[PDB]
Design an enzyme around this catalytic site. Structure first.
Site, PDB file in Angstrom:
ATOM      1  N   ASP A  48       0.299 -34.412 -36.810  1.00  0.00           N
ATOM      2  CA  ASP A  48       0.098 -34.646 -37.738  1.00  0.00           C
ATOM      3  C   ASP A  48       1.317 -33.513 -37.722  1.00  0.00           C
ATOM      4  OD1 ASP A  48       0.242 -33.544 -40.630  1.00  0.00           O
ATOM      5  OD2 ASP A  48      -1.909 -34.581 -40.579  1.00  0.00           O
ATOM      6  N   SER A  99      -0.457 -34.036 -46.438  1.00  0.00           N
ATOM      7  CA  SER A  99      -0.530 -35.566 -45.413  1.00  0.00           C
ATOM      8  C   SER A  99      -1.385 -36.843 -45.975  1.00  0.00           C
ATOM      9  CB  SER A  99      -1.806 -34.526 -44.716  1.00  0.00           C
ATOM     10  OG  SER A  99      -1.083 -33.500 -44.492  1.00  0.00           O
ATOM     11  N   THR A 152      -5.404 -37.754 -43.024  1.00  0.00           N
ATOM     12  CA  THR A 152      -4.873 -38.880 -42.017  1.00  0.00           C
ATOM     13  C   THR A 152      -5.641 -40.125 -42.285  1.00  0.00           C
ATOM     14  OG1 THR A 152      -3.434 -37.216 -41.330  1.00  0.00           O
ATOM     15  CG2 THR A 152      -4.070 -39.068 -40.144  1.00  0.00           C
ATOM     16  N   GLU A 319      -4.675 -39.751 -34.183  1.00  0.00           N
ATOM     17  CA  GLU A 319      -4.095 -38.106 -34.783  1.00  0.00           C
ATOM     18  C   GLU A 319      -4.166 -37.427 -33.824  1.00  0.00           C
ATOM     19  OE1 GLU A 319      -5.647 -36.998 -38.541  1.00  0.00           O
ATOM     20  OE2 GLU A 319      -3.792 -36.034 -38.864  1.00  0.00           O
ATOM     21  N   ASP A 324      -0.679 -29.703 -37.204  1.00  0.00           N
ATOM     22  CA  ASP A 324       0.155 -29.523 -38.717  1.00  0.00           C
ATOM     23  C   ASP A 324      -1.112 -28.356 -39.090  1.00  0.00           C
ATOM     24  OD1 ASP A 324       0.913 -30.147 -41.469  1.00  0.00           O
ATOM     25  OD2 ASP A 324      -1.392 -29.900 -41.967  1.00  0.00           O
ATOM     26  N   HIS A 328       1.173 -24.822 -40.059  1.00  0.00           N
ATOM     27  CA  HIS A 328       0.579 -24.111 -40.683  1.00  0.00           C
ATOM     28  C   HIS A 328       0.477 -22.351 -40.760  1.00  0.00           C
ATOM     29  CE1 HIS A 328       0.794 -27.024 -44.319  1.00  0.00           C
ATOM     30  NE2 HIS A 328      -0.105 -27.602 -43.502  1.00  0.00           N
ATOM     31  N   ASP A 366       3.400 -37.973 -39.860  1.00  0.00           N
ATOM     32  CA  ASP A 366       3.362 -37.954 -41.185  1.00  0.00           C
ATOM     33  C   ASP A 366       4.934 -37.440 -42.292  1.00  0.00           C
ATOM     34  OD1 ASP A 366       2.302 -35.223 -40.880  1.00  0.00           O
ATOM     35  OD2 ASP A 366       0.563 -36.113 -42.416  1.00  0.00           O
ATOM     36  N   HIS A 367       5.251 -36.227 -41.579  1.00  0.00           N
ATOM     37  CA  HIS A 367       6.008 -35.758 -42.540  1.00  0.00           C
ATOM     38  C   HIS A 367       6.483 -34.244 -41.319  1.00  0.00           C
ATOM     39  CE1 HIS A 367       2.845 -32.967 -42.501  1.00  0.00           C
ATOM     40  NE2 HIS A 367       2.408 -32.459 -43.503  1.00  0.00           N
ATOM     41  N   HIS A 409       5.185 -27.492 -45.287  1.00  0.00           N
ATOM     42  CA  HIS A 409       5.792 -29.327 -44.695  1.00  0.00           C
ATOM     43  C   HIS A 409       7.542 -29.382 -45.199  1.00  0.00           C
ATOM     44  CE1 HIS A 409       1.264 -30.957 -45.253  1.00  0.00           C
ATOM     45  NE2 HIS A 409       1.779 -30.112 -44.482  1.00  0.00           N
TER      46      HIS A 409
HETATM   47 ZN   LIG Z   1      -0.128 -34.103 -43.118  1.00  0.00          ZN
HETATM   48 ZN   LIG Z   2      -3.914 -35.186 -39.900  1.00  0.00          ZN
HETATM   49 ZN   LIG Z   3      -0.033 -29.933 -43.404  1.00  0.00          ZN
END
Ligand SMILES: [Zn+2]
Ligand SMILES: [Zn+2]
Ligand SMILES: [Zn+2]
Ligand SMILES: [Zn+2]
Ligand SMILES: [Zn+2]
Ligand SMILES: [Zn+2]
EC number: 3.1.3.1
Lengths: 446, 446
Positions: A48, A99, A152, A319, A324, A328, A366-367, A409
């Site tokens: 993630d 997400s 996710t 995952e 992620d 953040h 995912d990004h 993101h």
């Molecule tokens: Zn994500």
């Molecule tokens: Zn996730």
């Molecule tokens: Zn995020």
């Protein structure tokens, strides 16, 4: 089908050809990596927010610039894919996805708005790759280091208009149409229990303490409902290891944490002018990661073992969640440690896949995210931090796309790598929704 | 060998399968993209600072999220490569390279320190792919939108301890050991004239006004030297079109601007809270781009034409330079316009390469950059700007890795795509120095 054994700098970085990662022409090896026969199994590894930047930062620190990730970097077929979401009102693209919408794109094949799970911009349900795999008779696995209510993992088993509809409480309030007591299919958690995957491992045990508002199990905590439905529950590594069967009759539900599972590495948060005013950081392992808490690689290995008993084959999504969160949080050490964590899991998957010979392994994100690798003497307007890499040199990381509490993101396209039957379908530019079609076709899912 | 004719969203982005870029299994097509026979020609397209982020931002704006770049995105074999530089004192890696050290890496196969051109950390000269190609008898081309004294084009013909040593004046002062009057090989410009590539097109006509401090042409301006050496000079598109021969006896030197050539698109600079306090921007074409000034695509087409007269084959490096400059300048429109400009040039190369059948085309960047695509409502600590994309939606771009005048480069690994014989060598993880060996081998250079 070979895996890149070693793509590390072949020698002395300072000498000619010393920093090379190749030792000869790759044409033949690539020809041997191409196969179109059906995939019997599929293992989807998701980091993630693990964009190209996150991968490089993690490699530089843990393996060295000339280093090589035995898992993440070992996949032969590579490409880049887009993950833009859609604006709910206009149907026009929304360049930076959350997400939830991204997870829905690869699990259903349809784009959606930010915050949605398993539904399109018209809030209409769409079957997920897991639901389809299960319908076809294949074993299914859903593993993650985050709460299972998290976007996710949830995306493979729930269909709600908002990712916030964790349990009954939140659902009734935020997702009226999904509220069980209002004739809906239930919250993310309630739908997880219904979906009935063979193996489901993650955190978020707290949410299972809520009580259902309606149905057969009204008044019963979701944990109790789980037990009554036949789910075999495990909460630590020892018990996880004692599990021998994981099937539709005795499905496994592992809850190893109240919330997200512990981060592997500790380190201070990035700070304004941190690479200037503050000393370089060396990450330290989290004393609380425990021996009683299974690692991502351990959970993956178990899921593979149990899911491999199924003659039909299996679909497993793993995952590496906290990459992620820590991104953040602008915490370099947490971010990197989770990437190294994921690497190990990728290795397990690649080892099995290599022996089995009919397994499509796919590693992606995912990004993209905030972190950037900037020059040591950089004076940035955001949060920065200098780190002591394995190279014995200093690397400065930066997060400066948000003045608020969390770094955001980003929309950049990012890497997607694969190995096994049908891996060719990730090469070149592709869209995230293509991944749904790639997995369904590889599995001949019908 | 096919080129991806269309990897754009196949339909309605809002519907299932509507956002897909693939129409079927790619295994076969990929097998037809693999070839190991010798490459008769090589066209290297370099987007300065055109990382994955830069490419996405340009696609979103100009073609739409579900859009497709007919040039940049048409290359079938893709991967990611590293471009870290080296610390001159320690020999340890320097995670963020400048344009000079990176250009040296792919042009000589040896890593070096930031600011170096054609020399290693011990300031030792190393022959470039161009010098080698020439020695073998192949035609050579060096095209760019920047001043030819700029790091990228210079790297192929000059060997100096500092990229700052443009002409005699700066050289004597900053590069004593290279100063002509001190027994050195001369400045970047003086060495360019010695190198004698068949075709060299770019800007920086101002520097050619300086006078040599020693040698055969002491007292003569570099421009006059060029003339006396037999170089056929052109300063505009009309004259460039009149050129029929470009060979060792009558080499072409086009100088179309005092400095860097005009930017394609105009637009305002990013600004603090720009996506909040200011209205969305629609880029406007630069009125001064002129009809008298040849575009990057025009220069590319001419170089290919003239270079293709050579029976042996040719090496051509084309650079979309201002992507980096405009990225530093935090000017979204300038950045994107230059990426669209490069796309056109990649198309001409792809068209020729497809008909010729023995041409290896490579499109990549020397290093990643600052620009990030963030959510519309983002409150960032740096400079931001909202843009009106082709989708009729708004995209916000951010630059926040420097409080100073120029936004900086970043260390993230980035895309490298190729097409033709030996393109397989860019797939998976590779290092920038590998590109040197790939090109040399593909050309059978010896
Ligand atoms: Zn994500
Ligand atoms: Zn996730
Ligand atoms: Zn995020
Ligand atoms: Zn550069
Ligand atoms: Zn350049
Ligand atoms: Zn630059």
């Amino acid at each position: 089908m070979p895996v890149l054994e070693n793509r590390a700098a072949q020698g002395d970085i300072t000498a000619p050809g010393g920093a090379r990662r190749l030792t000869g022409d790759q044409t033949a090896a690539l020809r041997d990596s191409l196969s179109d026969k059906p995939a019997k199994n599929i293992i989807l590894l998701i980091g993630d927010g693990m964009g190209d930047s996150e991968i490089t930062a993690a490699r530089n620190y843990a393996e060295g610039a000339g280093g090589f990730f035995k898992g993440i970097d070992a996949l032969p077929l590579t490409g880049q894919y887009t993950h833009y979401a859609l604006n709910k009102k206009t149907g026009k693209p929304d360049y930076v996805t959350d997400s939830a919408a991204s997870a829905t794109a690869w699990s259903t094949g349809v784009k959606t708005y930010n915050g949605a799970l398993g539904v399109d911009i018209h809030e209409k349900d769409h079957p997920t790759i897991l639901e389809m795999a299960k319908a076809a008779g294949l074993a299914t696995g859903n593993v993650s280091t985050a709460e299972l209510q998290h976007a996710t993992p949830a995306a493979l088993v729930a269909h709600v208009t908002s990712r916030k509809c964790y349990g009954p409480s939140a659902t009734s309030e935020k997702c009226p149409g999904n509220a069980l007591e209002k004739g809906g299919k239930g919250s993310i958690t309630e739908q997880l229990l219904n979906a009935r995957a063979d193996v489901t491992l993650g955190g978020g045990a707290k949410t299972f303490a809520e009580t259902a508002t309606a149905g057969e199990w009204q008044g019963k905590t979701l944990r109790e409902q789980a037990q009554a439905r036949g789910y075999q529950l495990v909460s630590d590594a020892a018990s996880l290891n004692s599990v021998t069967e994981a099937n539709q009759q005795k499905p496994l539900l592992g809850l190893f944490a109240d919330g997200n599972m512990p981060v592997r590495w500790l380190g201070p948060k990035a700070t304004y002018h941190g690479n200037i005013d503050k000393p370089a950081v060396t990450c330290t392992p989290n004393p609380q990661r425990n021996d009683s808490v299974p690692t991502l690689a351990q959970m993956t290995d178990k899921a593979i073992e149990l899911l491999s008993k199924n003659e039909k084959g299996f679909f497993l999504q793993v995952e590496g969640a906290s990459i992620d969160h820590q991104d953040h949080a602008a915490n370099p050490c947490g971010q990197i440690g989770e990437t190294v964590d994921l690497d190990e899991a990728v290795q397990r998957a690649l080892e099995f896949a290599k022996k089995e010979g009919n397994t499509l392994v796919i590693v992606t994100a995912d990004h993209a995210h905030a972190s950037q690798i900037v020059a040591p003497d950089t004076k940035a307007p955001g949060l920065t931090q200098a780190l002591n890499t394995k190279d014995g040199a200093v690397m400065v990381m930066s997060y400066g796309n948000s003045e608020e509490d969390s770094q955001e993101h980003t929309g950049s396209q990012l890497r997607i790598a694969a190995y096994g039957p049908h891996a060719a379908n990730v090469v070149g530019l592709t869209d995230q929704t293509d991944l749904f079609y790639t997995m369904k076709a590889a599995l001949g899912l019908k």
